[PDB]
Amino acid sequence: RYKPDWESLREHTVPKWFDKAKFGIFIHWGIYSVPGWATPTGELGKVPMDAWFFQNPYAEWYENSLRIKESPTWEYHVKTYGENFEYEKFADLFTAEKWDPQEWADLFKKAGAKYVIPTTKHHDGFCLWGTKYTDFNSVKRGPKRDLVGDLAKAVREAGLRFGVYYSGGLDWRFTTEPIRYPEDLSYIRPNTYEYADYAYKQVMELVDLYLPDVLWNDMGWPEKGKEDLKYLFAYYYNKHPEGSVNDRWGVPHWDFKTAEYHVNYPGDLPGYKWEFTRGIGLSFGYNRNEGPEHMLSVEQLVYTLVDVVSKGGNLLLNVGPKGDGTIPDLQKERLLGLGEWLRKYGDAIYGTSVWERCCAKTEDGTEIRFTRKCNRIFVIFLGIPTGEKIVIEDLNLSAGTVRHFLTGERLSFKNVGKNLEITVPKKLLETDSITLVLEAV
Amino acid sequence: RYKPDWESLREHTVPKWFDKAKFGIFIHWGIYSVPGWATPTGELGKVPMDAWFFQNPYAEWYENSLRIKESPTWEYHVKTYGENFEYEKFADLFTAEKWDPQEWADLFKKAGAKYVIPTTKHHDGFCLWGTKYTDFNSVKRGPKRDLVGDLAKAVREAGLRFGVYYSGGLDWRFTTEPIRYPEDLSYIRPNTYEYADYAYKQVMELVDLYLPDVLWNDMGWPEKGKEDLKYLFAYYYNKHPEGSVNDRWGVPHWDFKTAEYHVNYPGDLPGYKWEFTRGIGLSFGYNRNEGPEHMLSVEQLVYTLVDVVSKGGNLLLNVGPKGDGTIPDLQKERLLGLGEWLRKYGDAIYGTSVWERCCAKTEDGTEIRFTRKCNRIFVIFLGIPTGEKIVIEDLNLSAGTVRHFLTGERLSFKNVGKNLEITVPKKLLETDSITLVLEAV
Amino acid sequence: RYKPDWESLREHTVPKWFDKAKFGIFIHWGIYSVPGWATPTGELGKVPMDAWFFQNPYAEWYENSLRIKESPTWEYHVKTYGENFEYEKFADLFTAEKWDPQEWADLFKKAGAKYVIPTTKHHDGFCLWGTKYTDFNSVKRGPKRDLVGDLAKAVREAGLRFGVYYSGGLDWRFTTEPIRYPEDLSYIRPNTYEYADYAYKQVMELVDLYLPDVLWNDMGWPEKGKEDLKYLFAYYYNKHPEGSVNDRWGVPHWDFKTAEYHVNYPGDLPGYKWEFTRGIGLSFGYNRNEGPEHMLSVEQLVYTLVDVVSKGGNLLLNVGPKGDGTIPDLQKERLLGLGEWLRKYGDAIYGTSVWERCCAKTEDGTEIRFTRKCNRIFVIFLGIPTGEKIVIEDLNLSAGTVRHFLTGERLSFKNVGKNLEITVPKKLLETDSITLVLEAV
Amino acid sequence: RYKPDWESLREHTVPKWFDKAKFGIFIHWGIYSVPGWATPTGELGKVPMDAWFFQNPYAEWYENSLRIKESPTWEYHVKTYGENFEYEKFADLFTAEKWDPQEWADLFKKAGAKYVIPTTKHHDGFCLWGTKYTDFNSVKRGPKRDLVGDLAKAVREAGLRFGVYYSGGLDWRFTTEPIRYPEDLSYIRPNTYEYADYAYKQVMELVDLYLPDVLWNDMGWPEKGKEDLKYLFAYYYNKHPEGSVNDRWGVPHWDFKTAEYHVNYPGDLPGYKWEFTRGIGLSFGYNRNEGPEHMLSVEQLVYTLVDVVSKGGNLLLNVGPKGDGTIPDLQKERLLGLGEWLRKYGDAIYGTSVWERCCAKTEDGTEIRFTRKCNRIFVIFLGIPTGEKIVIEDLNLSAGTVRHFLTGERLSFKNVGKNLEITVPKKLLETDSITLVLEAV
Ligand SMILES: CC(C)[C@@H]1NC[C@@H](O)[C@H](O)[C@@H]1O
Ligand SMILES: CC(C)[C@@H]1NC[C@@H](O)[C@H](O)[C@@H]1O
Ligand SMILES: CC(C)[C@@H]1NC[C@@H](O)[C@H](O)[C@@H]1O
Ligand SMILES: CC(C)[C@@H]1NC[C@@H](O)[C@H](O)[C@@H]1O
Numbered sequence A, B, C, D: 001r002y003k004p005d006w007e008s009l010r011e012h013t014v015p016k017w018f019d020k021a022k023f024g025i026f027i028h029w030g031i032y033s034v035p036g037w038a039t040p041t042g043e044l045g046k047v048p049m050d051a052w053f054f055q056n057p058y059a060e061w062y063e064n065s066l067r068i069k070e071s072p073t074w075e076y077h078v079k080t081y082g083e084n085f086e087y088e089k090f091a092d093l094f095t096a097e098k099w100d101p102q103e104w105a106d107l108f109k110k111a112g113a114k115y116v117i118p119t120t121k122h123h124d125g126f127c128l129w130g131t132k133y134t135d136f137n138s139v140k141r142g143p144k145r146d147l148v149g150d151l152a153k154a155v156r157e158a159g160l161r162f163g164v165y166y167s168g169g170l171d172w173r174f175t176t177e178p179i180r181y182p183e184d185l186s187y188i189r190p191n192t193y194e195y196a197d198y199a200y201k202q203v204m205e206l207v208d209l210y211l212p213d214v215l216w217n218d219m220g221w222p223e224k225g226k227e228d229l230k231y232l233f234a235y236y237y238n239k240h241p242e243g244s245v246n247d248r249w250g251v252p253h254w255d256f257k258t259a260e261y262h263v264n265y266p267g268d269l270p271g272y273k274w275e276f277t278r279g280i281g282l283s284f285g286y287n288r289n290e291g292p293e294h295m296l297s298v299e300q301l302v303y304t305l306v307d308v309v310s311k312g313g314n315l316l317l318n319v320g321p322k323g324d325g326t327i328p329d330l331q332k333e334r335l336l337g338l339g340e341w342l343r344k345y346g347d348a349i350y351g352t353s354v355w356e357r358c359c360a361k362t363e364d365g366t367e368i369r370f371t372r373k374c375n376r377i378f379v380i381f382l383g384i385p386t387g388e389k390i391v392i393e394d395l396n397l398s399a400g401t402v403r404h405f406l407t408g409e410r411l412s413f414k415n416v417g418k419n420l421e422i423t424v425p426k427k428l429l430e431t432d433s434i435t436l437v438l439e440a441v
Helices: A015-022 A060-069 A071-080 A087-093 A100-109 A147-157 A180-188 A193-210 A228-239 A299-310 A329-348 A426-431 B014-019 B059-067 B071-078 B087-093 B101-110 B145-159 B180-184 B193-209 B228-239 B298-310 B329-348 B427-430 C016-022 C057-065 C072-082 C086-095 C101-110 C145-157 C182-184 C193-210 C229-238 C298-310 C329-348 D015-023 D059-067 D073-080 D087-093 D101-110 D147-157 D182-186 D193-210 D228-241 D298-310 D331-350
Strands: A021-026 A116-120 A161-166 A214-217 A257-259 A274-279 A313-319 A358-361 A366-373 A377-383 A391-392 A400-402 A412-416 A419-423 A437-440 B023-025 B114-122 B161-166 B214-217 B258-259 B275-280 B312-318 B359-361 B367-373 B376-381 B388-394 B402-404 B410-416 B419-423 B437-440 C023-027 C115-121 C161-166 C214-217 C258-259 C274-279 C312-318 C360-363 C367-373 C376-379 C389-392 C402-404 C413-414 C419-423 C437-440 D023-027 D115-121 D159-165 D214-217 D256-260 D273-280 D313-319 D359-361 D367-373 D378-381 D387-392 D402-404 D413-416 D419-423 D437-440
Touching: A015 A313, A021 A161, A060 A087, A100 A147, A100 A329, A116 A147, A116 A214, A147 A193, A147 D182, A147 D256, A180 B145, A180 C145, A193 A214, A193 A228, A193 B193, A214 C193, A257 B214, A274 A299, A274 A400, A274 C086, A299 A313, A299 A329, A313 A329, A329 A377, A329 A437, A329 D378, A400 C360, A437 C329, B014 B161, B014 B312, B014 D023, B023 B275, B059 B071, B059 B087, B114 B145, B145 B161, B161 B193, B161 C214, B193 B228, B214 C298, B214 D087, B258 C161, B275 B298, B298 B312, B298 B329, B298 B367, B312 B329, B329 B376, B329 B437, B359 D228, C023 C161, C023 C274, C057 C072, C086 C274, C086 C329, C101 C145, C101 C329, C115 C145, C145 C161, C145 C193, C145 C437, C193 C214, C193 C229, C193 D193, C229 D073, C274 C298, C298 C312, C298 C367, C329 C376, C329 C437, C329 D147, C376 D073, D015 D159, D023 D159, D059 D073, D101 D147, D101 D331, D115 D147, D159 D193, D193 D214, D193 D228, D273 D298, D298 D313, D298 D331, D298 D367, D313 D331, D331 D378, D331 D437
Parallel strands: A021 A116, A021 A313, A116 A161, A161 A214, A257 A274, A274 A313, B023 B114, B023 B312, B114 B161, B161 B214, B258 B275, B275 B312, C023 C115, C023 C312, C115 C161, C161 C214, C258 C274, C274 C312, D023 D115, D023 D313, D115 D159, D159 D214, D256 D273, D273 D313
Antiparallel strands: A358 A366, A366 A377, A377 A437, A391 A419, A400 A412, A400 A437, A412 A419, B359 B367, B367 B376, B376 B437, B388 B419, B402 B410, B402 B437, B410 B419, C360 C367, C367 C376, C376 C437, C389 C419, C402 C437, C413 C419, D359 D367, D367 D378, D378 D437, D387 D419, D402 D437, D413 D419
């Protein structure tokens, strides 16, 4: 039994399933997916923040962008939907006509994912379940359906874990002015006791209805409601000890940390569980303006995943579905591509632990990542060397055997000074896909 | 960009327009203006506080007075409207049948005023704009009109600044017991988190709808809502840096202080901007029981204004209109009288600064006030001496010239010991109105 | 770098060396060791708390007991040292004339311990290092020696980790009234800002002088100083990431929990690292009145360690040295005995992890505990069965090889229903010592 | 009287003398001035902060640098003074044998300064007055003299205002670990209630002994002592209303803001009084390694002052004296040079106000700054144009007379489009020094 106080909640550590999962699917889906439009400006951390909100590459920020007159979104909206078309009207157009939760679940499973987390309420405040605290929801409007619950049921029947994303820190139904600068986030927030109660009642509602495996909050938690989390976390863990909580609440407790390119991404081994998140594209919500050139290739997804995992993290990859419930082909192809790689190399990923070091590189610059399972060390090349002779810089092994992972073939290697040389027959090199993988015992 | 914290908000100083304005018009108008009745007991600070609330001279406190059985208001009400007539019923009688916002604006402008501030919500909680947070408002009841917005538009078209008064500290729709003693104010207040949210949402609403030049709160701010003001003030100033806030919030920040006879009235020069407020009569809301004997004369208004200004303050003069929207003749005549004096002497008032001292008096007791504009010093007599020889006590001038302000005529004067003697030709003395004014360079 | 806030400090998890150490030695030593006397009443949780402080079995509480007149301690003190001998005078008799820190360290190492933690300051406030914050210390009085520093050097020379115990919660140099009842602890505390500063400064000094591997506070941290720990913990971890802190500070952070018979002792597997502590006898400080009847036998010590380890904990076993610095024979014998068992079976203890369950028992009630190392599961019997046929209740092994641990001999086994039968030749059983140990892969 | 609460303290605004002073002299002087050594790396905001503390260009940070072994400072110290020479020993070498406070004051006055502020205590905690709170001060050690008091008398004899700098935020007499990275500042602080008392007591003592015209704190105020400032500020203002405080306390109140190149430097007109500070060179304390290459030229100093003044600020220019109390020639030359320009053009600087805009430039890019005195607008060119025809971009004058400032000669000008043309006879241009100055009425 957990008690409602930070010192007692510290007894809850990240559950084993999460630590072993390594790969999950994020889903940003809502009424913003209907217009599904943003200018693909660039990546966060690379686009200047004095312009970011004025040319926001996140399609799910459509409403905020629309509130900024003459932003590209405003022009687009006016020309496409007209001035007499309020954002909320998109809830009636969000019909999810072609949604099939079992197909989604089957796809996520085939992609190699072990948990799924959809946006139950994003910044626009629209709720994707039949909440009793607002009528701005999927059961009363557009879909006429409990999207969260129906997806939960499908994800679980496919054997995957199910978490929930909730925008606790922002809700545009409680503010009128848009965020134009990063600094506006320090004061343009709901700010009321009423909003703190609402956020508390809704996350408790999600806990009671769906008992999620992960509570993924975003944008911090209302300051007036922070003390409520001691009770909410105890209430939650006492009903589901294997549940978990991310680190975006702004209180002392969390089970795992979160990182993005610009924030908290480690260069080497941290001593705590974390999770890296990013979209297949530059937006989280569907953006019809994105082409393959704005997306990671299957190879980059694999490398991203390997890097993350070798550093002790899980990858939470975001998918942005359309308003009709379909997953765009460009995204689906990248998911299947990753799932194929995982079906071959999954044993060197799932259930692994970090090694003594995460990283190395060859003499000719190919990057290498390591993962471990007891006595077995997985050596994962981000790429496949062309020549059979391979020199890994600054590494020596006290193992007695190095095998080619996929074929299981013993290989010849020797510590040559401060480096490690391994001979990989070209036949073997040709059997690998995207990554040459070795196994040392 | 202002940040939501007291130290950063300190960077916002009183805007120049307010400092230069000197004279504004307060308007206490609401459903209490229909019965428009109070016993004209006396001035605040002069009437004993153990009786004040039982024989309240403020007609806008009608509801509170009515809740005190057998107070004069209760007797009056029962005899006039009857016991089966609840105070709220006055909202349906408040029809503002003869209201013309442009006439009001024209009158205020002719009176010499530079800003106007109406009660958007007084203690009775009735709102004079179409707020979405209560149906007890002017758009839904009586007037069927947005009084605040329509007046805002007129005041601005006449070139005047527009502020809003809001009763943040008291709202009788949230309490049942009347205030009978000053000490009752320490505990008979809304007190709930709900009320703090409401006050916050309504002032933010006024900011978003009308973007006022002044936020004039009264009776303090709900304790549970004080931290909200850091955000509200930043939000406000970032949309209108030339806006301003009075000092009745009970938090660290304010742009100017407020004073009344009994409170904070300076005797000499303070080092900060302030504003003196009082009604033309003894009430703020219309009181049909007041006669000329309960009101300041045009002369007393002028003297009051001069004294205030010479001490660095602005005068915020209150007008109490009738339920039909007309301004009673006694008040209108006093406003025009003041406006006439200002049209002649305005250059020695508007845009001035305090001098080294505010005050002096003649050998025969006539009071004198000073104001300044760079090298010009205005010497304003509260009255017009009868003899041509004038001896100002304890004053010497290092100027090289003293002129009669209205005619511009050079005058003969000399420092005679510790006094100053000036000869003012009787012809000149006869050209002045209410105040003999001199100009020294 | 760690930051001074609980959220950031949560990133520091229990260091891997502590997790793997399993066994440490506690040392309560101080001026109270000179009289070294207490009435050996019983185990905590077994003695009525209405009498506990009056017949305190803890010799280190001598001073508090001495302050309760007519306690057995007061009678003994008066008769032995005299009514005029003030407790503090024991600091002049605490000479540690026969102390050899290298001998202690070698004994602790032979005992099988991996870390050692002496009392740097217990409740009587006497400090065993040359602290600059009080003259009541071992450098200025008694030993004329830095005992903590010399012990630290020796323990480290021996290859063991070194931590410090500090009585943050109690310091009788700041109070005059004794603790008579449990409830007295809620208010007979130093209570001042001065003491909060003093505790902070002394632990900071311990960190700067000795950079201990464990900060083991006792009796809570002064309330006025709790916020300081955010800074102390960050400072400490930033200088020594592999350092650790216990859970007796009363703030949100800790790396491991502590338990005693009556407190926090788990029945099965908790999800966090914890540590069980108890003495060899009934007191922590040396008690000349204890004989073998009041101490655990070597067998009981082994069973204790095994049970704690099978449940994820470390055993922190206390030694109470005499005033001359020697360790009594009865304690030294039990230490060497435990050390011989660990030399034989250490591989089933050190560096292990918990299995799916901690416990089981045979058909004739012999208790069994499990520990794990990757694929190897160690089955430790709390005792040595007499017959070769062994039936383990409610246990089935999906292993494929069960071996006698000491000889490595393969054994015959079979999952018979909900049980597991195993035959162990008596010659193998006769080779074991105190515990039969099997190994399953 | 001012009251001890932020709301009441807000009544105190920046004193008129500070607003008009425009230029003051900062003095970093202390025991660190004896070694007077640092590696002149670069300007703050220009040097990478990951190396900053390791190659600190600030000689006054000698002690912190000395605590980082293998810093250039440590190498220099060992070779010059010896490994056994503890930093504190510099207090015995700080003799100020050639110090003449009257000479310093006269130089500061000739330099054109109106106020002077010496370091009473910098981060090393050494106090330059006979404080009763520590023996580490100039009366008991080194100079055997009250330097702050003798300097105060001299500065005032010279007719200048006198303030005090105090390192409230840092005191290395309360810490042992050096600051290596910016982040270290969040926790390597005194942190105790004792230090909070100490800082309060010392500033109170400075107020009581010297009643300074400015309290210039640095590095924030200890968190546990922030509430004390309400009382300290009231106490101070009630004894000296014309006193002032800077903005580095971390509490709601301040009279003026402070800025440095990298911090708070305005691009145009802010609405509050502020002050720019920087040294003549790259260090604040004397650095024997700096030559003319690391210092501002007289021209650059003038351009600096003018720019800061046209934007509403005061320039607080730092001088770093040697350990013997003399001011190095290179700094004295630049001071006298600036003083000669102010003797010629001071009327366009002292007692001025900002105009409608601070800035403009000529067609060939000469920068121009404006200042104002009632009707007189001063047009200060940052340089002296070579040809007589001058075209000012985007400027139109509704004046009627433009005169050469130095000679008073009336000049020919014309608003030509969005620009202003002016002809300035070369004989007038040749009469100017460093800056061409015009005057428009
Ligand atoms: C990382 C991801 C969850 C993003 N968090 C910040 C949000 O503003 C954005 O829409 C998206 O949800
Ligand atoms: C000064 C004026 C604004 C008065 N403030 C106190 C109120 O109770 C009263 O009705 C009136 O508004
Ligand atoms: C467990 C052990 C460290 C005990 N803690 C409580 C103290 O009062 C007692 O003397 C002993 O140190
Ligand atoms: C601006 C000046 C007063 C500097 N403030 C920061 C200090 O660390 C530095 O030594 C110097 O005093």
